[PDB]
Write a protein that binds this ligand. Structure first.
Ligand SMILES: *[C@@H]1O[C@H](CO)[C@@H](O)[C@H](O)[C@H]1NC(C)=O
Ligand SMILES: [Ca+2]
Ligand SMILES: [Ca+2]
Lengths: 307, 305, 4, 74, 4
């Protein structure tokens, strides 16, 4: 009957926003369309550095702290001399030093969402000029190649140290006295143990705040490193658009899918939510057992050692 | 009646019509704004470009390599006839065809040469592709690269100052004793160079012996914490340093890198000389500004070819 | 996060 | 001389369409904005100078809220 | 230099 007013009132609160916000969002399809031109531009010119390689070297960062390497920066460790002396970043300040970094999160800079080769060889900046010295005392995000890693673990007793620091200062440290990244022939299986840690055993002890069948499919230990061109996940599905790596952003020992996700997608401020991610999933530098699926961090590193 | 005029408030048949496009455009729009990223990130894939870079050709010493090609005075991994982990050295190739190698250098003050034995051994400080960069290849290294079948090497003390001129002091049959006999040098004779020869003692008058001691030839290496000198103790530590000591020295290239050089009786920690002096050029207060000490296989002082 |  | 509110409804419904569609737009950007924000960053370690900006989600996650009210008309 |  009288429903004929929605023609002069209810509607007058419709095209008044379907125009509005479709405009005040039209001005987004603007900014967020030039800033891409304005950084794509200041991308025409690559960045550079000068890590004057210091004298002191060694087999790995341990022997190098056992050779006077007391400052933390870009060193040149050379494992079995049946290989090439690859630049690396040593930690010789926290925990008796000798900590050879493998991965490092502290800001954007490096797209960790790569493939096979890159994850195997390595990518990123192993270090940057300390802004006022010759060498490179400040670390930059990278993934010291897998192959390089699977070899370092292969030096008998390899013990990785996984640290993180959440945006509000606070920080915790994980740890697996026993760590071993098989060789690429094994799809790079990850064997970890001797877990100790105040950050939650998210690699083997699966994701805590959950339950059985849902949890254990958040165990990385015994997993086959994967990347969006190498489906070695735990997620069995004929559907190729759905794989633990194509989602969750990056390469990781994926087991349907993760209780921890360093190497995810870099999230600023930490907190983030599905309605933000490329695939809704909880992709990003997340360590679930300490912060849960919806909290990426500031810095997420991984330093190993022998013994 | 006229109410059938509602066909008027039937404007939305375009109050929505047009606007609608401003929707179907954005979506379609973003199809484009996809590649306008697919491409940007495909650029942000490589890391920063680094200056320092390792040439391939290698061999015995800098000379050997740079006789199998070579010409760019830079950085190569050498591996002494008898050695293990081929380390990294800062060669300095010339035109004639000889490749020197360095064990020292000084310019800024950066790499503080007041380290410890294990450091002065395996070598410390940081090299560089150019050369500009204080560094001490380290006594150990200096060994396997001077006693490799022992084809007579040499030292070429070079210099300069806060006034222009530079120099050069040579020595033949160069060698550094294995850590065993300690890191005591063993040469035969000074061989020219207006640089001077303070490795042959220098009498400061304080006492006739103001020269018997201050000889550096044959004097083992005295780090601050492990001296093998000829003092009532560790000279080095006294003026702080790790340099082939005696009671004490005359010519310091591993010491206090003084600004504007020339120091006094004030910057003397404990009280005596430590600066970058060298009596067969300048006194015991003038601290050199630059400094380097490179070696090379003897049969090069009159190479001819 | 696991998968359903 | 039948009036015709039929065409009316068919239009007001023709709106409900671009309310499903909008919510999509509004969110398509709530994630596209951030594919870039994250990829603009992923350059610092490859490309020279970078851009330092913001986003303000209290805009999107607000310009959303008022839209979730615009519903119910039959 | 020289010493005592
Ligand atoms: C398993 O995961 C699903 C995810 O939708 C959830 O609904 C369910 O409650 C979970 N149950 C367990 C065992 O945690
Ligand atoms: Ca699968
Ligand atoms: Ca003594």
């Amino acid at each position: 009957l009288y429903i004929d007013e929605t023609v002069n009132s209810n509607i007058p609160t419709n095209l008044r926003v379907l125009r509005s916000i479709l405009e005040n969002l039209r001005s987004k399809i603007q900014k967020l369309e030039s800033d891409v031109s304005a950084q794509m531009e200041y991308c025409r010119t690559p960045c550079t550095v000068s890590c004057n390689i210091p004298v002191v070297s060694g087999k790995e960062c341990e022997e190098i702290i056992r050779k006077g390497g007391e400052t933390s920066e870009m060193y040149l460790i050379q494992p079995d001399s049946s290989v090439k002396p690859y630049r690396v970043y040593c930690d010789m300040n926290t925990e008796n030093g000798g900590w050879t970094v493998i991965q490092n999160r502290q800001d954007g800079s490096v797209d960790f969402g790569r493939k096979w080769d890159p994850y195997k060889q390595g990518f990123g900046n192993v270090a940057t000029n300390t802004d006022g010295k010759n060498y490179c005392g400040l670390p930059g995000e990278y993934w010291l190649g897998n192959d390089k890693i699977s070899q370092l673990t292969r030096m008998g007793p390899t013990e990785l140290l996984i640290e993180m620091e959440d945006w509000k200062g606070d920080k915790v440290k994980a740890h697996y006295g026993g760590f071993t990244v098989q060789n690429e022939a094994n799809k790079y299986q990850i064997s970890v143990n001797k877990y100790r840690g105040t950050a939650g055993n998210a690699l083997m002890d699966g994701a805590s705040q959950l339950m059985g069948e849902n949890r254990t499919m958040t165990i990385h230990n015994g997993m086959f490193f994967s990347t969006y061109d190498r489906d070695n996940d735990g997620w069995l599905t004929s559907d190729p658009r759905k794989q633990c790596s194509k989602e969750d952003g990056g390469g990781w020992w994926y087991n349907r899918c993760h209780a921890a996700n360093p190497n995810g997608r870099y999230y600023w401020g930490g907190q983030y939510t599905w309605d933000m991610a490329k695939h809704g999933t909880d992709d990003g530098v997340v360590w679930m057992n300490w912060k849960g699926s919806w909290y990426s961090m500031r810095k997420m590193s991984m330093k190993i050692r022998p013994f | 009646e006229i109410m059938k005029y509602e066909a008027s408030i039937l404007t939305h048949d375009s109050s929505i019509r047009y606007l609608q496009e401003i929707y179907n455009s954005n979506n379609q729009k973003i199809v484009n704004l996809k590649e306008k990223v697919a491409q940007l990130e495909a650029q942000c894939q490589e890391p920063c470009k680094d200056t320092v870079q390792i040439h391939d050709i290698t061999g015995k010493d800098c000379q050997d390599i740079a006789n199998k090609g070579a010409k760019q005075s830079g950085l190569y991994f050498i591996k002494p006839l008898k050695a293990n982990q081929q380390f990294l050295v800062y060669c300095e190739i010339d035109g004639s065809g000889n490749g020197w190698t360095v064990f020292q250098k000084r310019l800024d003050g950066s790499v503080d040469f007041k380290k410890n034995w294990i450091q002065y051994k395996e070598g410390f400080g940081h090299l560089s592709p150019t050369g500009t960069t204080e560094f001490w290849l380290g006594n150990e290294k200096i060994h396997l690269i001077s006693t490799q079948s022992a084809i007579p090497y040499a030292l070429r003390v070079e210099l300069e100052d806060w006034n222009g001129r530079t120099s050069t002091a040579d020595y033949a049959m160069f060698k550094v004793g294995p850590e065993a006999d300690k890191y005591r040098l063993t040469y035969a004779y000074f061989a020219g160079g207006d640089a001077g020869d303070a490795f042959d003692g220098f009498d400061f008058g304080d006492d006739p012996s103001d020269k018997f001691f201050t000889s550096h030839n044959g004097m083992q290496f005295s780090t601050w914490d492990n001296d093998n000198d000829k003092f009532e103790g560790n000279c080095a530590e006294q003026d702080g340093s790790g340099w082939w000591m005696n009671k004490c020295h005359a010519g310091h290239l591993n010491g206090v890198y003084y600004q504007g050089g020339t120091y006094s009786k004030a910057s003397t920690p404990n009280g005596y000389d430590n600066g970058i002096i060298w009596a067969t050029w300048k006194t015991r207060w003038y601290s050199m500004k630059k400094t380097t000490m490179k070696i090379i296989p003897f049969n090069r002082l009159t190479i001819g070819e | 996060g696991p998968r359903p | 001389i039948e009036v015709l509110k039929r065409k009316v409804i068919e239009k007001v419904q023709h709106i409900q369409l671009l309310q499903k569609n909008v919510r999509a737009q509004l969110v398509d950007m709530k994630r596209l904005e951030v594919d870039i924000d994250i990829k603009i960053r992923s350059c610092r370690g490859s490309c020279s100078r970078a851009l330092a900006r913001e986003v303000d989600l209290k805009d999107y996650e607000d310009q959303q809220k008022q839209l979730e009210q615009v519903i119910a008309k039959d």
